[PDB]
Amino acid sequence: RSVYFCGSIRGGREDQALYARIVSRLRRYGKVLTGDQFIHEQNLNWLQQADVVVAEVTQPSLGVGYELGRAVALGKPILCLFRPQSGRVLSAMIRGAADGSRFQVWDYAEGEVETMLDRYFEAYLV
Amino acid sequence: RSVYFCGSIRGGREDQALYARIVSRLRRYGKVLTEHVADAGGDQFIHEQNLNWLQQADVVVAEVTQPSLGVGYELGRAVALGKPILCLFRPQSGRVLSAMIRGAADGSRFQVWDYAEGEVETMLDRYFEAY
Numbered sequence A: 001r002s003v004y005f006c007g008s009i010r011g012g013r014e015d016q017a018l019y020a021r022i023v024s025r026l027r028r029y030g031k032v033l034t035g036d037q038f039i040h041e042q043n044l045n046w047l048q049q050a051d052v053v054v055a056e057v058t059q060p061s062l063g064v065g066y067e068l069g070r071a072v073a074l075g076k077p078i079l080c081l082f083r084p085q086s087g088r089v090l091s092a093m094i095r096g097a098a099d100g101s102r103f104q105v106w107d108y109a110e111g112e113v114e115t116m117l118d119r120y121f122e123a124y125l126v
Numbered sequence B: 001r002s003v004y005f006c007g008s009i010r011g012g013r014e015d016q017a018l019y020a021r022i023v024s025r026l027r028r029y030g031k032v033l034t035e036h037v038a039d040a041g042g043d044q045f046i047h048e049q050n051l052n053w054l055q056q057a058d059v060v061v062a063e064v065t066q067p068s069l070g071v072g073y074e075l076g077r078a079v080a081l082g083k084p085i086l087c088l089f090r091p092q093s094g095r096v097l098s099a100m101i102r103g104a105a106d107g108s109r110f111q112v113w114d115y116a117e118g119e120v121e122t123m124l125d126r127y128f129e130a131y
């Protein structure tokens, strides 16, 4: 299995420890895949080859939204992880994209992100 | 002509006034489908409504200075729908634009225009007269 992981970079890195914990655990379930022109090309090539796309969508970010948009049109199964504890309200375009097994948006408490990812890959992935 | 405009909402509303200026100017060149940008459980409806608008749109315009999930998502869908896209970014803000947005630039099909505020209306006039 190949897992594409999205997180905020130029959108801000406030949740980057959370991203390392997500990436470490995604490694229990598959290979984790992840000149602006070359950066876009490289990541698109990875998105196109990915078996599942996982995105942490608490910190707003153009690139994360952009990767989710391209992934949905590709038909790739998607998991978005949102942290309501931030005090943020999740983008309507993201939470509203939710659609069966194809696109799921899970709210999480940060002390449980590892166990939620365990649950997703165990029972919520086709 | 139908025009889809993208601008941050829950990504933050600090560029609101400017979105109003953009939408007002965009009106001169087509009907702006996503009027709400200038101005629960129901998010499902919004996504459906906005994708419908996106499929119908002749051109997608996005002000990409404020980082936004929804804006990036709209841009992502629009590229996949083969839509002609204009992105507008303000280097004054002290932001660095997403490499995924800048790196998506592709001839006349996907453009990213750096501009100074006070100049946004003029830049909109330049794009539509040309393309």
Ligand SMILES: O=P(O)(O)OC[C@H]1O[C@@H](n2cnc3c(NCc4ccco4)ncnc32)[C@H](O)[C@@H]1O
Pocket: A005, A006, A007, A008, A009, A010, A011, A012, A034, A039, A043, A061, A062, A063, A064, A067, B097, B098, B099, B100
């Ligand atoms: O926040 P942008 O808006 O910065 O979102 C970052 C997302 O888009 C991708 N991405 C953005 N920039 C890069 C990137 N460039 C290095 C870099 C340095 C500074 C910004 O970006 N390399 C690899 N992936 C990138 C990542 O996969 C993230 O999920």
Ligand SMILES: O=P(O)(O)OC[C@H]1O[C@@H](n2cnc3c(NCc4ccco4)ncnc32)[C@H](O)[C@@H]1O
Pocket: A090, A091, A092, A093, B005, B006, B007, B008, B009, B010, B011, B012, B034, B036, B037, B045, B046, B049, B050, B067, B068, B069, B070, B071, B074
């Ligand atoms: O930064 P934000 O993430 O939340 O994402 C921005 C995009 O999200 C879209 N959007 C979000 N809410 C609405 C919205 N809400 C009003 C509404 C309620 C019911 C139907 O319409 N109307 C139109 N577009 C919306 C806009 O096209 C914005 O460009």
